[PDB]
Design a protein around this ligand. Sequence first.
Ligand SMILES: [Cl-]
Ligand code: NI
Ligand code: NI
Ligand code: NI
Ligand code: NI
Ligand code: NI
Length: 296
Amino acid sequence: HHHHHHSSGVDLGTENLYFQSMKLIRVENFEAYFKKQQADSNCGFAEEYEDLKLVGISQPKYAAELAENRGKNRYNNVLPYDISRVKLSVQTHSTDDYINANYMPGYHSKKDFIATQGPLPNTLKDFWRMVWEKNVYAIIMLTKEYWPSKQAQDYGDITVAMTSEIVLPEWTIRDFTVKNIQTSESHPLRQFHFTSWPDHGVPDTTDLLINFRYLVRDYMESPILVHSSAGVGRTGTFIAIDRLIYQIENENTVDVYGIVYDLRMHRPLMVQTEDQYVFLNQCVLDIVRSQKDLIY
Ligand SMILES: [Cl-]
Ligand code: NI
Ligand code: NI
Ligand code: NI
Ligand code: NI
Ligand code: NI
């Protein structure tokens, strides 16, 4: 009974959704389209990106604005929308449910990812609770510590213990156990840490992002938790490329505009600069160029 179509003049956000929330390009036409869009200092891509700027930002975020939850946001202007926020269980009051995090769609489902900020000192117990309560098995950390290394640490009613650390040049892979001290139930956890993605910036090469993503997929119901400082820019770019690669492999099509549109509908600022958006397109170009008769 929830399936309905809106009349005009009811929600201008929904009208935009129906009208222009997609720009689908077949891979066979993508090199020609990329050439057009990158001309004159990326004018075409800049227009796509500026058309995305107000998407999603009219949605309510009352929980995020509660006085009780102010200390739980890193920035007073990066706030989770109510509709997609990760709601935690409650012990003492309703606001116990709050964390600056959102469910983000991936290629396969609407809860494929949780996008969140790197924990604060006062939200560290909440962050590991989320990991526990939402059955997270993979964490993706994009930066340029909230976990133990030496011995087990308790964060609230959860104990975390490190079981492996492999340091590589571009990234680190850490394994943990996450154990509810009240119930004794333990889950495994793998953390994939990309170690030089600059804030507001992009990795040094497209291979680094693509190969890191494929590392995440080869080394993994349950959400993938992605975080960065604000939980939007690098986090959104990561999720986007993952969605794009699946769309290229399974469909023969690309929709960077539509995937970022969809991200913005679930959390603010996803893919936070124009260069990150252009970078997603250069990633696609390089994937397309690498996947590419005698006459008698
Ligand atoms: Cl950082
Ligand atoms: Ni229904
Ligand atoms: Ni439905
Ligand atoms: Ni219908
Ligand atoms: Ni409606
Ligand atoms: Ni900054």
